[PDB]
Structure 1
C-alpha cells in the first residue's frame, strides 16, 4: 500500500483565480492540484502524486465506465474564526471509504496514509479553503476500476484520486431556505441486501430520473420512500430528522435506523450524539411512515423536519408532495428552534469557535 512519505509533488506553474464564494455553483469549480495513485494486481500500489488538475487517460474498457466499479467520499475543510483550517471526523470518512472498497472488490489501502496524502493536497491548495464562516472546501476522494477488460470481474487495475472544490453557502440568503420534497413510492433508492449504506457510484445514477421528476413538479429534493408502509428514509442525499410529539405524547427527535438502506452520515451520528448529550427530549432511531407523519400533522404534533448531511448541515423541510396533494410541514413556524440550535452548535465546532474531539487542525 502507498505511503504519504513517498508523495511525488509536481506543482502547477500557473495558478487559477479563486471564485467569489457567494457566486459558487456546487461541484463546478476545481482547485489547482489533485492526488492520483495507480494500482495493479501485478505491481501493487504506485507512489502517490500531487500534480496539476488534469484529464484522466482511461482505456474505454475501464470497468468504472461499464459496471460502475467505483466509489467516492465527501468531506469538508473549514477555515476557522482563528484562521486554522480544520477537518471534521475525517477518520470516519476513511473507514467508510475502506469498507466501500472491500464491498466493491477495489484494492484496500492504508487509511492513515490516504488521510495524510489528503492533508498534504489541501495544505498545498489551502488558499482555496474559503475566507467565509458559511463556505468550505469539498474533498472528493474517488476510486475507479481501470481494468481494460469487459469481463465482469474483480479489477486488476484501479485509480484512487482526490479532487478539491470550494462550496459557498447552501442558502444564498446565508440562513434557512426551506425545501419542498417529491414523495413518489414508484422509485426506491436502496433495498435490504443492497449497497445503500456505501457511497458506491451505482447508488446515485439510478436516482437522477426521480430528481428530474421532483424538479418537474416544482420540488427541490426527493423524499425517498421504502416498503409497502411508505417508510420515509432520506431527504435527497441527506439523512432525515423529525422533531415531534410521538404516539406516547413524548417530545422526540426521530431518525430512521441504520438497517442497510440508510447512508450512515457523519452529521447524522453527531446530531444523535448532541441530542443524547442535551437530554431535553427522547432520541429514537426508529421507522417513520408517511401515515405516521400525516397522522401527527392532523394532531398538530409535528414541530420540525430537516435533512442533515455533507451538502447541508441542517436543511429545513416546509412541504411534501404525496398522492397528488401538497402537505405543509410547519418547521419554519416553530423557529425552527432545534434546527437553529443544531446549525449553531455544528458550525461553532466546524469553524473552531469551540474545542472538539470532532475536529483536527490541518497537517
Structure 2
C-alpha cells in the first residue's frame, strides 16, 4: 500500500559538507536525502541517508522512456527560527496525480509529507534565514524497470533532495512556432518530459534578445505560461470591468500552487473581478493600445511573482507597463505571501516542520 514514516531508517552523514558563506538556484545541496524503493513486494522502508549518487541499471525506464516526475516546494524559516512549508498538501496531491498519469506506484500523501518533514528537520541548519531566502524541496519519483519494453514499471524509486536558495522585470519572446503542451497531452502534469524540449526554445529567446519564453497555444495565440511559470494579467477588460485573469485549467496549464494561492487571495479580498479565462495576443494588443493593461506577471515557486515589462511578438516589440503601475498588485501579493510564509501572521497554509 504505502511506506510509513514510522519505519523511517535514519542514517546520519559522516562527511558533512561546508554550508555557503551567492545562492544560485538548484545547484547547492544539503547533507541528506530521502530514499524509498518500490518493487513487486511493494514499498521498502524509507531512509534518510547521506546525499549520494543514484546507481541505476543502464536499461532503467527512467532514462529511456521518461518515466519520471518531480515536485517543487519551499520551506521558510521565520524570525522565531521556526521552519514552515508552504501549502505542501497541494504538492503531495499534484505529485500523486503525476504518478497515476505515468503508471508509477501510489503512496500515502501524509506519509510522504512526514518523511519530508523529518528530512528537513534533519537538515534544518541548511535553511537560511536572510530576507527572501528559503529551502527548495525537490521530490522525484522515477520508474526503474530494467527493460526496453514500453510498459508499466514493476520497480520505482522515490527520492527527495533539498537546496538552499537566495523585483526585476523580464522580457519574453512570443512566437506561435513554439508549443509547450497541447489539449490531450500531459502539459498539466509536472513530468520531466515537458521540460527537455523547452531548452532549445529558451536559447532562441536569448538569441532574439529576450529573457524567457511566452508560450502561445492555438490558432488564436492564447498566452498560456511564461517560462516555467503561470501567467496573470491585471487589466480593465473589454467590458470595462477591472479584473485579474489567468488561463483556465483546460489541459495545457500546469496547476501551480502559487497560481491557486493568488486566485484565493484576490478572490478573498473581493475588490475586483477574478477569473480563469483564456487570454489571446489579439486581446492583449488591443488592451495595450487602449491603455487598459496594468500588470502582467508570472507565478511559480522558485521565483514567486515575476513582473513582465516587454513582449516581442514576431517583430513587434510590445511595452508592458507593469512597473509604471506600481506594480501595485504584485507588491500586495508579495507582501501578503511574505507575512504568511515567514510566520509574521499565523496561517492555515503553513505546515510547521
- Alignment of 1:177 with 2:168, yes or no, is yes
Aligned counterpart for 1:343 among listed residues 320, 328, 334: 334
Q: How does 1:177-326 map to 2 (within 5 A)?
A: 177-326=168-317
Q: Which runs of 5+ in 1 are unaligned?
A: 169-175
User: Does structure 2 retain, via aligned residues, the 8 Å contact 1:182–1:322?
Assistant: yes
Equivalents in 2 of 1:359, 1:131: separation in Å? 16
Equivalents in 1 of 2:346, 2:192: separation in Å? 35
Deviation at 1:81, TM superposition (A): 2.3
For residue 52 of structure 1, what is the aligned residue in structure 2? 50
Deviation at 1:14, TM superposition (A): 2.1
After superposition, what is the alpha-carbon deviation per residue over 1:343-362, rounded to whole angstroms, capped at 9, x for unaligned?
A: 10011101011111111111
TM-score between the two structures when normalised by the length of structure 1: 0.96
Aligned counterpart for 2:68 among listed residues 66, 70, 74: 70
Deviation at 1:73, TM superposition (A): 0.4
For residue 35 of structure 1, what is the aligned residue in structure 2? 34
Deviation at 1:66, TM superposition (A): 0.5
Q: C-alpha root-mean-square deviation of aligned residues, in Å?
A: 0.8
Equivalents in 2 of 1:314, 1:103: separation in Å? 29
Aligned length: 352
Equivalents in 1 of 2:108, 2:243: separation in Å? 40
Equivalents in 1 of 2:312, 2:60: separation in Å? 40
Q: Which runs of 5+ in 2 are unaligned?
A: none
Equivalents in 2 of 1:356, 1:234: separation in Å? 29
User: Does structure 1 retain, via aligned residues, the 8 Å contact 2:79–2:129?
Assistant: no
Deviation at 1:133, TM superposition (A): 2.6
Equivalents in 2 of 1:8, 1:358: separation in Å? 29
TM-score between the two structures when normalised by the length of structure 2: 0.98
Aligned counterpart for 1:132 among listed residues 130, 133, 145: 130
User: Does structure 2 retain, via aligned residues, the 8 Å contact 1:241–1:306?
Assistant: yes
Deviation at 1:239, TM superposition (A): 0.8
For residue 157 of structure 2, what is the aligned residue in structure 1? 159
Secondary structure of the 2:95 match is helix
Instruction: Give 4+ residue runs of structure 1 displaced > 3 Å after superposition.
Output: none
Secondary structure of the 1:321 match is strand
For residue 91 of structure 2, what is the aligned residue in structure 1? 93
Secondary structure of the 1:160 match is strand
